[model samples]
Target: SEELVAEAHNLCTLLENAIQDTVREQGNSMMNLDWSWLT
Candidate 1:
């Protein structure tokens, strides 16, 4: 159904929204004292 088509696009929209904040917070932790071998 066309309604399902409508719902499909939000899969990305909702997932991206979920990751936006999650990534930012995770990035903070990942950057702190992580990959110490890089330098």
Candidate 2:
């Protein structure tokens, strides 16, 4: 039904937002991590 579809869409949006937020929050930490020897 429409309600179910709407709920699923909202859930997907929430999950996407959560992933983006986590990536954004960790971007600096990721950049700063030492990985110079992996080349």
Candidate 3:
């Protein structure tokens, strides 16, 4: 498993950017990513 920790939270955006950026580059849609992360 990957460890993309957000050590600076309160609120975390670093891993958010990393995940979304990579997924977008790989031509993934918002709904699909939603499935991966939150469904």
Candidate 4:
């Protein structure tokens, strides 16, 4: 369970970073639009 918690934390951080990067690259206009392009 500890390992699963740690992995989940890492995944959360990774996804946060990816979202930040996408916002940085695309600008605030995307904040209200569909984010399907990020995938």
What are the lDDT figures for the candidates, one per model? Answer: 0.81, 0.90, 0.61, 0.89
Candidate with maximal lDDT: 2
Model 2, C-alpha of 26: deviation from truth (Å) = 1.4
Residue 14 alpha-carbon offset, candidate 2, angstroms: 0.4
Clashing residue pairs for model 3 = none
lDDT of 1 by residue, 1-39 (tens): 688988988888999999998888776664566686777
Best by TM-score: 2
Q: How many clashes in candidate 3?
A: 0
Per-residue lDDT tens digits for candidate 4, residues 1-39, read 899999999999999999999879676674788888779
lDDT of 2 by residue, 3-38 (tens): 999999999999999999988977677678789989
lDDT for 13 (candidate 2): 99
TM-score of 4: 0.63
**lDDT score of model 4?**
0.89
In model 2, the runs with Cα more than 4 Å from the true position are 30-39
Consecutive 10-residue window with the lowest summed lDDT within model 1: 27-36
Steric clash pairs (candidate 2):
none
Cα RMSD (Å) between model 4 and the true structure? 10.7
Residue 31, model 3: lDDT of 58
Q: Each candidate's TM vs. the true structure?
A: 0.55, 0.65, 0.39, 0.63
Ranking the candidates on lDDT from highest down gives 2, 4, 1, 3
